[PDB]
């Protein structure tokens, strides 16, 4: 499960009294703050947010964006939004710059359930206007655009239920796309690797194995390049192992020299609560190395500090 817990004796009016000293005056109390805010869940987080209005008088997210920069400020903030509109305003962002951030938009709509996505869409209506679907198809284009629109109408099945027939015929059209590069009749790829359930397509993948004598990640990585390539490997991860692929999006966002802190940040603040004790198990499992080590190696400050206790511990 996740590594963030619900706080025991809380009282958001005591934490709005000591979000508000650690913030007045000159300067910051930022350990004061980490203290607080990174050992409450986001809902007892949203009860704060609430009684610092009614019980100090301002605005608490104000108080933060005005007391607080850079990354940390980044975490912090991504903290104190409620879970769907995090996930919103992520996608927002992701269209919304010169160039598309498409690692984000894969990320999100790969990695949802159809419930979420449910949600997604409906709050991203009501706060942009416009729905998602519109957005990507503006942002977004050819083959990359079509996967991401399937994605976007979250109508994966949710039984579990095996149709053999209906498994074969899958596997056969998954292998005819694969020999066509991916191009051709998109709809009928997509609704196989989109619309059916989990357990159906995890057979899916074994039938194509033997079909093909490839498994099908290969196959995707050698008939496709970019995102378009991303998109398919990442339905088929996130079938897979879902928590296998958020400690590989958190692995090459911190390998090397630099850091991809925008993914960092989005993957440890939306997993803390969810499965981060799983994410965490395969992380050291497919690196050799734990989660901790490797943002203690790539961060610093207050930054780092928040990271750790959304990590939970070393391995
Ligand atoms: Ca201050
Ligand atoms: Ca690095």
New binding site residues.
């Given amino acids: 499960g996740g590594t963030v817990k619900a706080a025991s004796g809380f009282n958001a009016a005591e934490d709005a009294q000591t979000l508000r000293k650690a913030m007045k005056g000159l300067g910051t109390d930022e350990d004061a703050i980490i203290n607080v805010l990174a050992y409450r869940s986001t809902a007892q987080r949203q009860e704060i947010r609430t009684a610092y209005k009614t019980t100090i008088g301002r605005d608490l997210m104000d108080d933060l964006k005005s007391e607080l920069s850079g990354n940390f400020e980044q975490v912090i903030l991504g903290m104190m939004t409620p879970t769907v509109l995090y996930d919103v305003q992520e996608l927002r962002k992701a269209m919304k710059g010169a160039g598309t951030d498409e690692g984000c938009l894969i990320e999100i709509l790969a990695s949802r359930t159809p419930e979420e996505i449910r949600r997604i869409n409906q709050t991203y209506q009501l706060q942009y206007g416009r729905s998602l679907e519109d957005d990507i198809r503006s942002d977004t284009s050819f083959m990359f655009q079509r996967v991401l629109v399937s994605l976007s109408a979250g109508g994966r099945d949710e039984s579990n239920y095996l149709d053999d027939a209906l498994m074969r015929q899958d596997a056969q059209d998954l292998y005819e796309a694969g020999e066509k590069k991916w191009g051709t009749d998109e709809v009928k790829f997509l609704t196989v690797l989109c619309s059916r359930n989990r357990n159906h397509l995890l057979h899916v993948f074994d039938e194509y194995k033997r079909i093909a004598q490839k498994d099908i990640e290969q196959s995707i990585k050698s008939e496709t390049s970019g995102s378009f390539e991303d998109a398919l490997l990442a339905i088929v991860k996130c079938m897979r192992n879902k928590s296998a692929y958020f400690a590989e999006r958190l692995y090459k966002s911190?390998?090397?020299?630099?850091?991809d802190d925008d993914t960092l940040i989005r993957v440890m603040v939306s997993r803390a609560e969810i499965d981060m004790l799983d994410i965490r198990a395969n992380f050291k499992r497919l690196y050799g190395k734990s989660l901790y080590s490797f943002i203690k190696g790539?961060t610093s400050g207050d930054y780092r500090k928040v990271l750790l206790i959304l990590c939970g511990g070393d391995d």
């Fill in positions: 911190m390998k090397g020299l630099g850091t790539d």
